[PDB]
Design a protein around this ligand. Structure first.
Ligand SMILES: NC(=O)c1ccc[n+]([C@@H]2O[C@H](COP(=O)([O-])OP(=O)(O)OC[C@H]3O[C@@H](n4cnc5c(N)ncnc54)[C@H](O)[C@@H]3O)[C@@H](O)[C@H]2O)c1
Ligand SMILES: NC(=O)c1ccc[n+]([C@@H]2O[C@H](COP(=O)([O-])OP(=O)(O)OC[C@H]3O[C@@H](n4cnc5c(N)ncnc54)[C@H](O)[C@@H]3O)[C@@H](O)[C@H]2O)c1
Ligand SMILES: [Cl-]
Ligand SMILES: [Fe+2]
Ligand SMILES: [Fe+2]
Lengths: 382, 382
């Protein structure tokens, strides 16, 4: 069968790319924006970075800063509520994954009112209408929500992170500038950083993978690998490299699926508020051993682009080094090695597994996994 | 300053990608297509491959097949006329750069009645309104018109091919299937493929080059350089690999520039009907030399992914090996080595050099060029 690629129709890149917004807005004759963000972001005057411009350029905006980390259905519903009484024409998402995943959730239901429950919207959400135009403005080096046809909501009632996939999500225009992401404390840089490295590795070896996907993913790894460290350290250029590499990572996995790292991280999100990027970080390499045999030459390139001298190693040698370059990046960026450090309880392993076994992402893993494969992975990552 | 990237919001890739067409149209309720093609494409049962699926799916379509290579203003005028007179809702473009570029011309003017003339539309087209939605379907392993933000028209009057650049022109979906491209005779696969390697190389070194665009272009060269031989020699898997290559190149250079090769090829088309890719082909290595010294480490990369063992080389050895790699491909693919061979006239060189100097692409060249520099160039390529 054929392979479909969904990208942003327009995207702006690099420091000050947010400058382009007011004109994008103009060129499309939008009238009012609903900004969708955190209170944290509004307080550090990150949001101001955009709103101020909108002020000079004469552009109407209102705010919903109600998004909490791991955005819940109630959060989504509130935004929709705000949006629908705003007079807003479109929406601007300033934020990482939470506000951005909210905003898409918000945009879809505003045109697919049929789905007001927000659970039906999991899977390949069967939407007849394209979302309210959205301008995506990421402020983390991670999620790549600005480019992905997916968004994840938390359903408190059912303590489960559920994933929505729908080409209708796709922002009209993405503004990716490292200026908006400089605010990120070091822990948050490392976390988002690794979320993307995860994105890129899972995408490289997912089941839908193919030529275009493979190229982008490996690029993004190459970028992330050689930059997350100095970005975590503060060097500004590396922030810009990170900003890019997570964006490249999204061009792939979005259009091609992920795998079980993400499948095991979600339930972990929903169960213990474990920061999504941190979950992945811990699992990633353990899932990489679990996957090593089913990935052809792949890990060899993964080892390469992460600085390892793969030349004349056995495929087994290369497969280790890549898993090892990963363990090594997490430690060097201050991610805690074990699940116990982030307070996972073994009594929960059988649940976590079932939730992982069910999570939409898991299907992409190159190697099918039963309950008891996952029970093990969690145990050995604990 | 910031970089902008303009891409297809949807694209399908893979043998049979046209199959997803009837679907897109339906998912977004258009009503009547104006198919824009060649009489040849019609006659070689190739258009049928799409009209048959649309008939079977219940979709209405009309067709304008009046297009010629290096499409004239009149061709664009006449086509539009037909569209204005068919109740056509959106447009499907089937064919190489010629019907695709004619198709964009039509889609733009039919929304920007302002430039009903087609000269007033050269350069950064001051168009106020997005083109009529165009679904693009290439039948050549070249042009990349399905993803680029530009089209080229022949002014038979002032005889010069001129280039129009406008994000409004971007097709909504692009459909990339080698199945469409199989009919190309070896000379055609050869010509259009090296147009593709020309874009990949020009866009790799063009003035606006940067991280993301370098990545695509370098991937493109890798792919093209690896498959052209086989495509031309008949390999269908080579055909598919190509189909992708040229698209990828499109993703790069649309968003960044080309340079002297296109700038000296456009005035050659206009004067002598020299096919776009053969003009490019002949011209490419010479312009490469002229450019060598102003292209950083780029040639070293170019040479590697064209199979040259750049291992122990100096940037000098390496730059030379790149220009060399191309002379090899041209030979191997059956393109004439000299402009003399394709009817170019020493008398005309001044006029051509002037034309080249004026071409929008030229200014993208890493090495600034003068009239006399272009003269030298045409002369040394003759
Ligand atoms: N299905 C998928 O493809 C998948 C993949 C990746 C991420 N996700 C989703 O992404 C979400 C996580 O998003 P996230 O990690 O970007 O962060 P976030 O939006 O959830 O929150 C991070 C915290 O950091 C603060 N913050 C954010 N940006 C900042 C900055 N620039 N400077 C200072 N402080 C900042 C915020 O206020 C917030 O409290 C989760 O809901 C996750 O499930 C899903
Ligand atoms: N601005 C730019 O970036 C740039 C780059 C590439 C091309 N161009 C322009 O676009 C056009 C290039 O078009 P092209 O090179 O694809 O060729 P084309 O569409 O102009 O036509 C070439 C000939 O090949 C035939 N043909 C095409 N596909 C076929 C198939 N599958 N089977 C059998 N015959 C087939 C056509 O019928 C036609 O006779 C040129 O006119 C050129 O001026 C501009
Ligand atoms: Cl108001
Ligand atoms: Fe993630
Ligand atoms: Fe070309």
């Amino acid at each position: 069968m054929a392979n479909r690629m969904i990208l942003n129709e327009t995207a702006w890149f690099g420091r000050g790319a947010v400058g382009a917004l007011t004109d994008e807005v103009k060129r499309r004759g939008y009238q009012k924006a609903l900004i969708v963000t955190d209170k944290t972001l509004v307080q550090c005057g990150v949001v101001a970075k955009v709103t101020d411009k909108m002020d000079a350029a004469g552009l109407a905006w209102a705010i919903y800063d109600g998004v909490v980390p791991n955005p819940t259905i109630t959060v989504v519903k509130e935004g929709l509520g705000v949006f629908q009484n705003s007079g807003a024409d479109y929406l601007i998402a300033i934020g990482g994954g939470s506000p951005q995943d909210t905003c898409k959730a918000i945009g879809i239901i505003s045109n697919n009112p049929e789905f007001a429950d927000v659970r039906s919207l999991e899977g390949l959400s069967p939407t007849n209408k394209p979302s309210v135009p959205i301008l995506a403005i990421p402020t983390t080096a991670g999620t790549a929500a600005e480019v992905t046809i997916n968004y994840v909501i938390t359903d408190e009632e059912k303590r489960r992170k559920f994933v929505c996939v729908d080409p209708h999500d796709i922002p009209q225009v993405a503004f990716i500038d490292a200026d908006m992401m400089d605010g990120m404390p070091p822990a948050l840089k490392a976390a988002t950083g690794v979320d993307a490295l995860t994105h890129a590795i899972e995408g490289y070896i997912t089941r839908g993978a193919w030529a275009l996907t493979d190229a982008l993913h490996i690029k993004a790894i190459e970028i992330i690998a050689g930059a997350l460290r100095g970005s975590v350290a503060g060097d500004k250029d590396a922030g810009e490299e990170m900003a890019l590499g997570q964006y490249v990572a999204g061009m792939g996995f979005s259009n091609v699926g992920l795998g079980l790292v993400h499948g095991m991280a979600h339930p972990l999100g929903a169960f213990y508020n474990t920061p999504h990027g941190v979950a992945n970080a811990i699992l990633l390499p353990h899932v990489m051993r679990y996957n090593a045999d089913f990935t052809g030459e792949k890990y060899r390139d993964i080892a390469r682009v992460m600085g390892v001298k793969v030349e004349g190693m056995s495929l087994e040698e290369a497969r280790n080094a890549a898993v090892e370059a990963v363990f090594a990046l997490n430690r060097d960026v201050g991610i805690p090695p074990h699940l116990r450090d982030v307070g996972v309880r073994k009594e929960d392993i059988p649940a976590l597994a079932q939730a992982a076994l069910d999570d939409v992402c898991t299907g992409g893993n190159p190697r099918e996994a039963t309950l008891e494969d996952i029970v093990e992975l969690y145990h050995t990552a604990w």
